[PDB]
From a paper:
Purine nucleoside phosphorylases (PNPs, EC 2.4.2.1) are cytosolic enzymes involved in the purine salvage pathway metabolism in most organisms. The enzyme degrades (2′-deoxy)nucleosides based on 6-oxopurines to the corresponding purine bases and (2-deoxy)ribose-1-phosphate. Purine nucleoside phosphorylase (PNP) is a well-known molecular target with potential therapeutic applications in the treatment of T-cell malignancies and/or bacterial/parasitic infections. The results are supported by a crystallographic study of eight enzyme-inhibitor complexes and by ADMET profiling in vitro and in vivo.
Compounds 45i and 45n, however, have quite distinct poses within the active site: major differences between the position of the central phenyl moiety as well as substituents are observed. While both bulky substituents extend toward the helix, their poses are quite different, and each makes different interactions with helix residues. Crystals of hPNP/45i were prepared in a hanging drop using EasyXtal 15-Well Tool plates, with a 500 μL reservoir, which contained 1 M lithium sulfate, 100 mM tri-sodium citrate, and pH 5.4.
Author numbering:
A (entry chain A): 3 to 287
B (entry chain C): 4 to 285
C (entry chain B): 4 to 286
The structure:
Amino acid sequence: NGYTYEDYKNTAEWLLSHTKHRPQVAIICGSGLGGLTDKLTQAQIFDYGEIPNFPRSTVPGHAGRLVFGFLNGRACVMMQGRFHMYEGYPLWKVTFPVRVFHLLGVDTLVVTNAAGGLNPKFEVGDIMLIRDHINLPGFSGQNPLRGPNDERFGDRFPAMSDAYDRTMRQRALSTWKQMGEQRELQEGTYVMVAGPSFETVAECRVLQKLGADAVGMSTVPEVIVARHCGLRVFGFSLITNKVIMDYESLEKANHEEVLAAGKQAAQKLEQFVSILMASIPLPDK
Amino acid sequence: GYTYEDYKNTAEWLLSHTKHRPQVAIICGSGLGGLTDKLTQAQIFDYGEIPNFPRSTVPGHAGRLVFGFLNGRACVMMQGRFHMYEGYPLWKVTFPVRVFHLLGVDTLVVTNAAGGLNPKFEVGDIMLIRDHINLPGFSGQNPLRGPNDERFGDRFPAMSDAYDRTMRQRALSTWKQMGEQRELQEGTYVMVAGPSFETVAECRVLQKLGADAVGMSTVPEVIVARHCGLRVFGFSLITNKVIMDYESLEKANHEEVLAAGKQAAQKLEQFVSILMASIPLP
Amino acid sequence: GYTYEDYKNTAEWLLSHTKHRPQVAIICGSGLGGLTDKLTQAQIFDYGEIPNFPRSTVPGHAGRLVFGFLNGRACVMMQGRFHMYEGYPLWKVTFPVRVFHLLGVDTLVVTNAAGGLNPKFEVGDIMLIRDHINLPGFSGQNPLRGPNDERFGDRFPAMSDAYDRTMRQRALSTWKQMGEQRELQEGTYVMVAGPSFETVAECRVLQKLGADAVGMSTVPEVIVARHCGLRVFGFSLITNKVIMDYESLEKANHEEVLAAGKQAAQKLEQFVSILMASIPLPD
Ligand SMILES: O=c1[nH]cnc2c(Sc3ccc(Oc4c(F)c(F)c(F)c(F)c4F)cc3/C=C/P(=O)(O)O)c[nH]c12
Ligand SMILES: O=c1[nH]cnc2c(Sc3ccc(Oc4c(F)c(F)c(F)c(F)c4F)cc3/C=C/P(=O)(O)O)c[nH]c12
Ligand SMILES: O=c1[nH]cnc2c(Sc3ccc(Oc4c(F)c(F)c(F)c(F)c4F)cc3/C=C/P(=O)(O)O)c[nH]c12
Ligand code: NA
Ligand code: NA
């Protein structure tokens, strides 16, 4: 299947008529930010299943949630969880919410994730501001824009060379500076791979040689649709593990360690984003 | 997928609806739409009247098959080509090449627009396609995926000799004989699916791989053509230099591509028309 | 699109139709189908007659599971693997591996035909697979894609240790104490979808990525086996040297790869039989 413009329209107008909230900022909560909805005021919760056209979470855990409220005084719409390719979702389902956000009047997307460090400078618990991406699925046909283009969203052939807003990154660094934290923020290129299996050593070397600083399984498709629509985009990676890059290492990527990294970073990440909210540019006069 | 009878039905319909017996198929990429103007004794078919032929489901652009003589060479020209980014399966993109084979065509000329990755290239350059990197193909988006039909070709066709050496030497010589000074480029075309343009990081990847130009077409048609045994010649119009640093304000856009096309139209149409005399006879 | 109950039904059907209890699964690559003849007490099942099993769709394609003993070790052989280029989805290509797991198999041996990228390789060489590059996997053609079930494995299994170090050692040891002419090669297998062979520029890309051999199979079976916790090892027979530069009259062709996988193929088959004795017993 796909979605028509009318489908997005009906979802948007249904949400506009069922909440008083008028979000400026969309937060898609990746690994470690599950709990960020807890810091919202005047929170209003919709299960994906209540929302017309909205893909249902078919994965273990709670019904996926769209939550409207104020984060540090700023009108937010928050996706508690996101869809992954590795779960069997087509990219036109993964990115469905980004079109709806656009039609609600959102002008800014915050997108976070977990990723493996490819840059040897990176340490577990580091935060990497996404400055650029390598869409490996994109190269082969797995681009969320594949299909007919609606001129109501954007151009047939949108540019991605300016996708990661300079100002948002400037203000992430300021916020971080004023937290007087010990470690610098990192900044680099995120490469998307479909996953869900972790890289071989030979694969890690490929991604290093390609110039990737971190690797994960999400985010790029949401960024491409956001940019098609004209939203400004801010992203970062929690570095949950250092990808294994030689045959002599005794270490090995694993689910238990990357869960532990998320759980440990979780409150630091909520603190970071809660404060950053205060510094997000206002809608344009 | 199509059955073998589906291809035979379409080829039979065309052969009984036109008297034309094309030797050469020309797939007009951006910059070359107007090449049909140079045909004589033209005979026209909307894709929509041609049995089994894929159309656009966008009323924006329909498509035409045009039979005619180009500089006295019997030709069939696709005006409007199918792209993976539009949501066509590759077995639809490449459907026409199968039909051309069954019409008796023995040479495919394929042209496109491409972003320049080789820093030697300028906007408005023509690059002869010497070789390709098929990134979608590596992942399973190869037009031969599925059952193989020996009436077309082998299970496992070689692509190491896809781009006819003789036609490229004759294209270079023709470009000089025409008294053109700004030289013909030659190099490696990488297909990416698009339709969004590359990030800086992606551009750097495509350069590290050894690609000289990047586009969103052509490689599937070339693979199916070589599977069928067609001789293949092609080139890219360098419509833009791909952004390779973070400071430049240039953003790749459709308007640059359109505008580079119109500017190069007269020159490319002349080049292809005159090249027809270099194509070996059947 | 099966659930755990489907794989279980298939395994129980096999358990109740043969007394054979395999420890080792062998997937026989192109030109290596002779290995089923080295089985003792052989028992054949056509894929057609196995519940839920994907049917192979080419007129003359051997779709048979063969249970037996190879050099005195209980095993099950696939004669004819499924290939993504034939049009099979990876969940079909790898359904037998999940069934082997439920049958109690703890080891998978994978064999294939590969094009040589390493200029040191010669046609007929055997390359012990040390590592792989899953190019289809990067893009979404990963056989774990979709719902995960822990009766198979983890949502995010590691692949950096896929190729069993113990069986590496013993393959190198066994090969030496056979006094063979050429050495056993080792290196990285890159999977491409095919079915068309590589351009020179594609060749050069795969070499730049650090691949030693290229083919169109194997990696997805390895991923599903490691997901399930099976020990894995495997071999490429080098059927052809990939054309890596424009000064050359050679062309990789179906006929020259067919002929090469009738030559030192029987060498790899004897080597696989011998190495059965080096596979550890189950606890
Ligand atoms: O080396 C690597 N290679 C390739 N990819 C990767 C990834 S992506 C990933 C890997 C594991 C995972 O599990 C959890 C998890 F389930 C939690 F609940 C959690 F808190 C947590 F930190 C995790 F890491 C989530 C995600 C990424 C989801 P998303 O954030 O992109 O939506 C991490 N490291 C590597
Ligand atoms: O930097 C680059 N990166 C990756 N790819 C490219 C391409 S390929 C391309 C990009 C845009 C485009 O826009 C149209 C278009 F779609 C029309 F239909 C049209 F009439 C028209 F004028 C255009 F400008 C056409 C084509 C090329 C089609 P083709 O020649 O392969 O058939 C050019 N530059 C880059
Ligand atoms: O240069 C290369 N590039 C990319 N890929 C490759 C391959 S993989 C391959 C290529 C051709 C082929 O055909 C047969 C065949 F059909 C038989 F019946 C046969 F006996 C036989 F020896 C062949 F070579 C089989 C396979 C491999 C299947 P598998 O071993 O993985 O299952 C080999 N060389 C290259
Ligand atoms: Na000649
Ligand atoms: Na690649």
